[PDB]
Amino acid sequence: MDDYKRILITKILKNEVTEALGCTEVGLIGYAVSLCNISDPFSIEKIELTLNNGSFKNAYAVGVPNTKKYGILPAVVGGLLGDHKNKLLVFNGIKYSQKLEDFIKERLKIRVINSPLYCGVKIKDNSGNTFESLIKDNHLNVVIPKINNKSEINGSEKEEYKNLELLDFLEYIDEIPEEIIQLVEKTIYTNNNLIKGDFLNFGNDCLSNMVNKTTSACNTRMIGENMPAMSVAKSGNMGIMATLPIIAYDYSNEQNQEKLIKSILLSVLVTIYATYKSSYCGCVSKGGMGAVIGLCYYKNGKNIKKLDSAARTFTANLPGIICDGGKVGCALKLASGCFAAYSSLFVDISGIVGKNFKECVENISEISKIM
Amino acid sequence: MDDYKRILITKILKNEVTEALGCTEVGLIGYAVSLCNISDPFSIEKIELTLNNGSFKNAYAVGVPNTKKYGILPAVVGGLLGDHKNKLLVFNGIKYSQKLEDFIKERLKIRVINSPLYCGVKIKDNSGNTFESLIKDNHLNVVIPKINNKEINGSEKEEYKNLELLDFLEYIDEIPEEIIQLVEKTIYTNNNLIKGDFLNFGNDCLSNMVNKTTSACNTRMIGENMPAMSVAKSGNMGIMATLPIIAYDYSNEQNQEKLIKSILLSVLVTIYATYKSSYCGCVSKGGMGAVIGLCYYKNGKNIKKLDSAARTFTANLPGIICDGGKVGCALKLASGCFAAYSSLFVDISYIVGKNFKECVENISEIS
Ligand code: SF4
Ligand code: SF4
């Protein structure tokens, strides 16, 4: 109950657990375009968009909220209508214009580079003036223009979090502040609304519900429904993975909101922890690690001996950072994570895996660095 | 319905679908030791065993059939009793001796190297004579001593690689009675491996496939004196290709006529994938046979649906790492069970090939 640690955890929670309208492929392009502040989008003589291949190879199949269209073209058009102050929710409240899409289709040129996250926007208008944007590395790292949005978690606050143990997260889920309780309740509500039908259902059993509900929420997001998702560390998929299996497991079990809240928070805490300790398919390795720990708390309580067994079994049955199948193969990856996390609660491991939760998170983090 | 196709397929079915007693980790050590032909195992002054790390990190937790012990020590002791003519099945009919294990424990020295498959055995006896064995690269590639090598031919294998899924679908309609008995044997042999609950979480079709496949897998791992019908010398690959289809049939129509066709189709696809690739790999090739086999039982010879099942399974391909501790292998098969079953309910648009042959080559490229 360090109180100083409570202050650290709560700042990390408000900085990483945030809303996002649409996938961050289209959300990033829209926000980068929106930062140019083109007063009259019909004045654009030419527009160049510079994206990395890691964000290009998937944006073609992602639907843009409030447009009824899919791909990069409506993400840029949407950006020209949305407000830069909305950040990741740039597509919110936009009134789509087909006349603008027809005008922009002609002047839009896309350059693709092989590098980490990069999203540059260069615009030249009829008057001869030029405009520039640049979001690099992190989904909210705005390089151009200069925006003194001072609070973002600095390196010391991040390093202090990486040094925490599972025992601290187990103590925190008892001493929860009311803002964090409302943030967790918001997360549970936001991602619950994403469930809109059957995507991969094969029964009424607990596992098939987790798979169906997690994949339905995942699909709803990817098709471009005007519904925000509560993302964890800027990843909408990682927030879905960390929450939906626990929401669906609660529904199929006690239906205890008090327990659901603690388990969802524990899961989110573990997810951010793994993300911080990781290097450059982390959705299911980091998100699924939060899910397996969260499900283990609901099913066993604060039994460290059983929480450590769940982490070793999950790490042994690691899905595979493949990712390669665009999106929809993205939902299949979440479904696989659902299976790995649920099955890990019924097997105990006696090599390639660590001894405890902290050792396993570092082993996963090592796999993502070299491979 | 070419007559030359029936000839090559049947000759390959009898060459790849064979029995196996214990995991090929322990089976390899036993066979390599057995090739030294130590007339009196109690005459051994010293023994050195040279294994690669890819086979050492497994063998400590693997049980040796007919010994009631686990590990390298009883695999070497068992090898000193078994016949080199038994090959991979060297542990069959052995009468374990604790007195020999006590004597050998003292003189056994293990050297571990970081290289592809290697299993060398050097022995020096009380009389001053020396003996040597060496199996490297393939589980049956005996380098030392020089053997006849017998029929697995390069022209025949290449002819099978060039075949299409259409040939395997035609073959499951004109099956020879020896192949029908071989498939029936496979279904029976691997069904007997199911010995309890390993990973059960319900009564549903999927949880049955997972539980039965992992229980069968575990039985083999613990060294029970029960052979398993391996596919291309892999017991795990043989389990993966058959158990989900045996457990799906049990939970569905319980049709032995369709079970045989589906099991054969699965085995055919497994050998095909194995031939197409070099150098985890049981669930990618064995699970590909399982997904095609399950798709035939559920949809028949619908090529449009068989191609969709292959693309979905290739998209949802399990982990690349070979799970250690041997316990991790049961978990890998369980994951393959999930990937194969779930692939029959999702269709993929547009990595990921267009048809079954393209997907097998994509998997082969990853390995
Ligand atoms: S495959 Fe995994 S890492 Fe890649 S986008 Fe989908 S969930 Fe994220
Ligand atoms: S982890 Fe995969 S490749 Fe390795 S032994 Fe197990 S099934 Fe075979």
CA angle (A5 as vertex; A3, A9 as ends), nearest 5:
115
Q: Cα(B234) to centroid of ligand 2, in Å?
A: 9
Interface mutation vs chain B, best among A312, A328, A334, A363, most B CBs within 10 Å: A328
Q: And the tokens for B180?
A: 């029908």
Contact status of B184 with chain A (Cβ, < 8 Å): no
Among residues A295, A297, A284, the alpha carbon closest in space to that of A169 is found at A297
Q: C-alpha dihedral over B354, B356, B362, B365, to 10 degrees?
A: -150
Contacts of A211 (CB under 8 A, 6+ apart): A200, A201, A202, A335, A338, A339, B342
CB contact under 8 A, A202 and B205: yes
CA distance A246 to chain B (A): 17
A17's tokens: 């657990």
**Who's near A273: CB < 8 A, 6+ residues apart?**
A161, A162, A164, A169, A361
Q: Whose CA is nearest to atom 7 of ligand 2?
A: B282
Joined together, the tokens standing for residue B37 give 């032909």
* Token couple for B349: 């648009």
Answer whether B38's CB lies under 8 Å from B84's CB. Answer: no
CA distances from A169 to A14, A163, A297 (A): 16, 12, 11
Give, as one character, the DSSP assignment of residue B62: P
Q: Determine which helix (DSSP H) or strand (DSSP E) holds A363, and give its type and residue range.
A: helix A357-370
Helix (H, G, I), strand (E, B) or coil at A148: coil
**Closest C-alpha among B227, B215, B216, B223 to residue B69:** B223
Q: Are strands A44-52 and A118-125 parallel, antiparallel or unpaired?
A: antiparallel
Residue A36 is assigned to a ligand binding site: no
Judge whether B266 and B289 are in contact, CB under 8 Å: yes
Q: Report the chain A residue with the minimal C-alpha distance to residue B343.
A: A332
**Distance between CA B107 and CA B221 in Å, rounded?**
27
Determine if the peptide bond prior to B176 is cis (ω within 30°): no
Give the span between the Cα atoms of A207 and B318, in whole angstroms: 18
Cross-chain residue pair A322–B324, CB shorter than 8 Å: no
Our CA-based measurement puts residue A142 at a distance from the nearest CA of chain B, in whole angstroms, of: 32
- Give yes or no for a contact between A266 and A175, defined as CB atoms under 8 angstroms apart: no
* C-beta of residue A254 within 8 angstroms of C-beta of residue A332: no
**H or E element at residue A352:** none
Which among A85, A198, A72, A79 has a CA at the least distance from the CA of A131? A79
In this structure, which amino acid lies at residue B315?
A
Taking CB atoms and an 8 Å cut-off, how many pairs form between chains A and B?
117
Q: Is A288 in the pocket of ligand 1 (CB under 6 A)?
A: no
Cα torsion angle, B290, B294, B299, B301, sign: positive
Q: Known catalytic residue: A23?
A: yes
Up-side HSE of residue A289: CA atoms within 13 Å toward CB? 31
- The rounded distance, in Å, linking the Cα atoms of A210 and A200 is 10
Residue owning tokens 């197409």:
B276
Q: CB-CB: which of A200, A203, A352 is closest to B204?
A: A203
Resolution of the experimental model, in Å, one decimal:
2.9
Assigned token pair, B168: 């395997």
Contact indicator for B82, B94 with CB cutoff of 8 Å: yes
Give the Å distance between the CA of B329 and the centre of ligand 2: 5
Contacts of B34 (CB under 8 A, 6+ apart): B79, B80, B82, B83, B84, B86, B90
CA distances from B53 to A325, B138, B212 (A): 33, 15, 30
* Spatial distance between the Cα atoms of B63 and B75, rounded to a whole number of angstroms: 9
Architecture of domain B24-144: 2-Layer Sandwich (3.30)
Ligand 1 binding pocket includes A237 (Cβ within 6 Å):
yes
**Chain B nearest C-alpha distance from A182 (Å):** 34
DSSP-assigned letters across all residues of B67-80: TS-BSHHHHHHHHT
- A116-139 as b/e, with b when 16 or more CB fall inside 10 Å? ebbbbbbbebeeeeebebbbbeeb
What are the residues whose beta carbons fall under 8 Å from the beta carbon of A334, sequence distance 6 or more? A214, A215, A218, A237, A240, A241, A244, A283, A284
Listing DSSP states for A75-141 in one string gives HHHHHTTS-GGGGGGTTTT----HHHHHHHHHHEEEEEESSSSEEEEEEEETTS-EEEEEEESSTT-
Q: Where are the domains of chain A?
A: 21-144, 164-370
CATH assignment of A21-144, given 3.40.50.150, 3.30.1330.120, 3.40.50.1580, 3.30.1160.10? Answer: 3.30.1330.120
Residue A244's alpha-carbon distances to A196, A217, A321, B299, in angstroms, are 13, 8, 20, 32
Nearest residue, CB atoms, A329 vs list B315, B323, B332: B315
Quick one: residue B217, left, alpha or beta (phi over 0 = left, psi -120 to 50 = alpha)?
alpha
Half-sphere exposure of B192 (CA within 13 A, CB side): 12
Alpha carbon A129 to its chain's center: 36
- The nearest CA of chain B is from the CA of A37 a distance in Å of 36
Q: How far is residue A154's CA from residue A142's CA, in Å, rounded to a whole number?
A: 15
Q: What is the Cα–Cα distance from A229 to A191, expressed in whole angstroms?
A: 6
The Cα–Cα gap between A335 and A212 comes to: 8
R_g of chain B computed on alpha carbons: 21
| Residue from A333, A336, A367 to probe ligand 1 pocket by mutation (most atoms less than 8 Å from CB) | A333
Q: Is the peptide bond before A245 cis (omega within 30 degrees of 0)?
A: no
Nearest by CB to A346, from B201, B323, B351: name it. B201
Nearest C-alpha in B relative to A328? B348
DSSP B198: S
Give the burial class of B86: count Cβ atoms within 10 A of its Cβ; 0-12 exposed, 13-18 middle, 19 or more buried: middle
Asked if the Cβ–Cβ distance from A343 to B210 is below 8 Å, we say yes
Alpha-carbon B8 to chain mean position = 21
Cβ atoms within 10 Å of B327's Cβ, excluding its own: 21
| B228-231 and B44-52 strand pairing | unpaired
E-assigned strand segments in chain A: 17-20, 44-52, 108-113, 118-125, 130-136, 142-144, 229-232
User: Do A341 and A303 meet the contact criterion of CB atoms below 8 Å apart?
Assistant: no
- Asked if residue A283 has its Cβ within 6 Å of ligand 1, the reply is yes
**Distance separating alpha carbons of residues B172 and B300, to the nearest angstrom:** 11
For the four alpha carbons of A196, A198, A203 and A207, in that order, the dihedral sign comes to negative
A-interface mutation test, from B197, B342, B358, most A Cβ less than 10 A away: B342
